[PDB]
Amino acid sequence: TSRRWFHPNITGVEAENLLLTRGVDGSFLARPSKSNPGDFTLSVRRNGAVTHIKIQNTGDYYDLYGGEKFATLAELVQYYMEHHGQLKNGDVIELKYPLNCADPTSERWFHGHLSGKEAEKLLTEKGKHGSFLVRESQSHPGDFVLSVRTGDDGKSKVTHVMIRCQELKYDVGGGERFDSLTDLVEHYKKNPMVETLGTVLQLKQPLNTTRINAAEIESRVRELSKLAETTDKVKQGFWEEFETLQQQECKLLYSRKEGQRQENKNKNRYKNILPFDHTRVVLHDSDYINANIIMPEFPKKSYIATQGCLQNTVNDFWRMVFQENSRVIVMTTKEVERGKSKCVKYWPDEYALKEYGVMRVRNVKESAAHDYTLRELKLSKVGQGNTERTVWQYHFRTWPDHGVPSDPGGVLDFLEEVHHKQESIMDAGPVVVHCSAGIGRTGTFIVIDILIDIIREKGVDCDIDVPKTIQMVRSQRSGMVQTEAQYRFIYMAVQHYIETL
Numbered sequence: 042t043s044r045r046w047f048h049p050n051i052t053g054v055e056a057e058n059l060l061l062t063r064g065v066d067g068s069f070l071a072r073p074s075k076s077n078p079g080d081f082t083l084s085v086r087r088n089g090a091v092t093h094i095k096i097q098n099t100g101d102y103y104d105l106y107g108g109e110k111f112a113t114l115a116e117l118v119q120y121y122m123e124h125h126g127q128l129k130n131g132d133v134i135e136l137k138y139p140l141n142c143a144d145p146t147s148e149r150w151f152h153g154h155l156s157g158k159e160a161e162k163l164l165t166e167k168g169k170h171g172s173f174l175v176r177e178s179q180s181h182p183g184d185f186v187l188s189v190r191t192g193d194d195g196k197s198k199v200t201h202v203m204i205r206c207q208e209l210k211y212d213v214g215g216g217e218r219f220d221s222l223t224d225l226v227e228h229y230k231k232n233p234m235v236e237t238l239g240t241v242l243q244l245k246q247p248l249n250t251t252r253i254n255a256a257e258i259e260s261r262v263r264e265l266s267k268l269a270e271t272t273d274k275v276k277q278g279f280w281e282e283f284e285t286l287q288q289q290e291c292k293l294l295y296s297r298k299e300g301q302r303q304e305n306k307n308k309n310r311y312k313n314i315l316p317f318d319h320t321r322v323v324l325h326d327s328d329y330i331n332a333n334i335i336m337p338e339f340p341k342k343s344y345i346a347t348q349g350c351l352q353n354t355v356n357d358f359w360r361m362v363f364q365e366n367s368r369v370i371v372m373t374t375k376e377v378e379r380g381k382s383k384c385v386k387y388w389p390d391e392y393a394l395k396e397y398g399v400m401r402v403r404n405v406k407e408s409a410a411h412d413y414t415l416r417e418l419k420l421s422k423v424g425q426g427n428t429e430r431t432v433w434q435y436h437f438r439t440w441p442d443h444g445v446p447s448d449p450g451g452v453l454d455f456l457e458e459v460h461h462k463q464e465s466i467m468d469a470g471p472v473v474v475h476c477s478a479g480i481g482r483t484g485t486f487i488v489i490d491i492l493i494d495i496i497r498e499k500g501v502d503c504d505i506d507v508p509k510t511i512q513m514v515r516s517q518r519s520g521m522v523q524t525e526a527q528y529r530f531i532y533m534a535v536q537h538y539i540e541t542l
């Protein structure tokens with residue numbers, strides 16, 4: 042796995058020159074857009090020239106101009122490198138050779154202008170055996186410092202290794218010279234440095250600097266929100282956390298074979314946004330629906346993340362709800378936004394009874410609120426009177442067309458009622474959550490609920506780790522939490538929750 046074709050800090054011109062001077066026809070890279078922040082650009086060399094293709098993401102998916110919609114940039118690159126997905130005035134565009142980035146900004150172990158002292162404190166307080174980090178050197182500009190903790194009262198220690206930058210290559214004073222910090226770290230991960238008297242300088246795991254005490258979320262958000270005036274002050278902020286998270290998505294390219302099978306193509310709202318095989322909901326008693334089980338310790342504490350129903354998947358949706366014993370549905374989209382259908386009406390009108398295949402649904406009563414509408418539904422299997430159970434649909438209607446709400450209070454009030462309903466139902470199955478593609482808004486809601494539930498169970502003095510939780514959810518459905526705006530909104534929502542306690 043590798044995501045080195047993503048260059049986080051280049052301009053369009055620098056991208057052009059890199060491709061023309063260091064690449065060949067078929068070379069490609071991706072980068073964040075500096076003209077329209079929040080978007081991305083895929084730049085590809087072919088026939089001695091560079092083509093730029095815009096990628097847009099407002100919170101639901103990566104929309105490649107002239108191409109398809111994708112759950113992550115890694116899934117997008119893999120699709121066209123493997124599949125052609127024919128990316129294409131007619132001509133074809135080939136992604137042949139990733140043009141690799143040497144910038145370490147988004148490595149989990151790189152901390153930029155961290156001082157050797159700030160670094161010593163973090164290693165002693167939060168470090169364990171094998172924790173390591175890399176930082177720029179103050180005393181020797183251009184060089185770096187690798188610090189490792191090893192141990193089990195003097196049973197553990199920290200060791201500092203100087204990394205020299207000599208005519209564009211990096212070394213630790215002897216042996217091989219590498220073209221980038223990443224190449225050097227990976228080498229000494231596989232081939233550990235060994236001290237004079239036997240100590241192995243094992244690079245076991247990057248030092249954790251994202252886990253926080255929930256009670257201090259306010260000061261942490263203040264810290265993460267800081268805007269560096271110069272690059273001297275560029276330190277760990279929201280953007281650094283998020284793009285370091287995004288770099289880890291190449292580890293999550295799990296198989297989605299079932300959703301690509303012939304008989305399942307038209308059950309997917311978006312052709313290339315598909316459920317992982319190893320967590321998809323399998324329908325027993327066709328077995329396919331575009332949905333995944335999300336567990337916060339990867340039933341009553343679990344979720345189902347799914348897409349907005351299509352007219353030909355409504356019956357399968359209710360088979361899933363019934364089979365999994367779900368009693369609560371969270372829908373975070375209108376039926377239609379920006380003139381386009383996001384989810385078909387899969388519930389009966391108020392007071393009406395409808396049959397969906399072998400499933401029967403009655404809309405007992407609707408209750409309208411400021412931000413959302415609650416629909417009380419009774420689901421039964423035709424021919425089995427004893428199977429009736431109430432299903433509570435919480436339909437949040439005011440999520441903005443693009444981006445995230447300006448204030449998390451309405452979402453948190455909505456989320457609180459959802460949680461209370463679920464908890465009052467004995468033996469309730471997983472909560473169903475869906476938007477359009479079921480990864481963006483859906484991922485944001487589920488992660489917030491997971492984080493708040495830790496505070497519920499352990500109190501405000503507990504540890505939470507936003508990126509850690511997201512990566513775990515992203516291992517069960519592709520691209521859960523789509524954008525930096527949503528990443529920030531998750532922090533803002535946990536902060537708002539704590540302040541109202």
Ligand SMILES: C[C@H](O)c1nc2c(N3CCCc4ncccc43)n[nH]c2nc1N1CCC2(CC1)Cc1ccccc1[C@H]2N
Binds near residue numbers: 154509
């Ligand atoms: C290892 C560290 O704690 C971390 N971790 C993740 C993280 N993940 C995803 C994978 C699984 C997972 N598991 C458990 C916890 C976190 C995570 N996502 N973003 C993360 N960001 C992190 N820091 C902030 C960003 C920099 C590294 C440190 C620190 C820094 C200073 C200046 C300039 C640039 C940068 C970033 N280079």
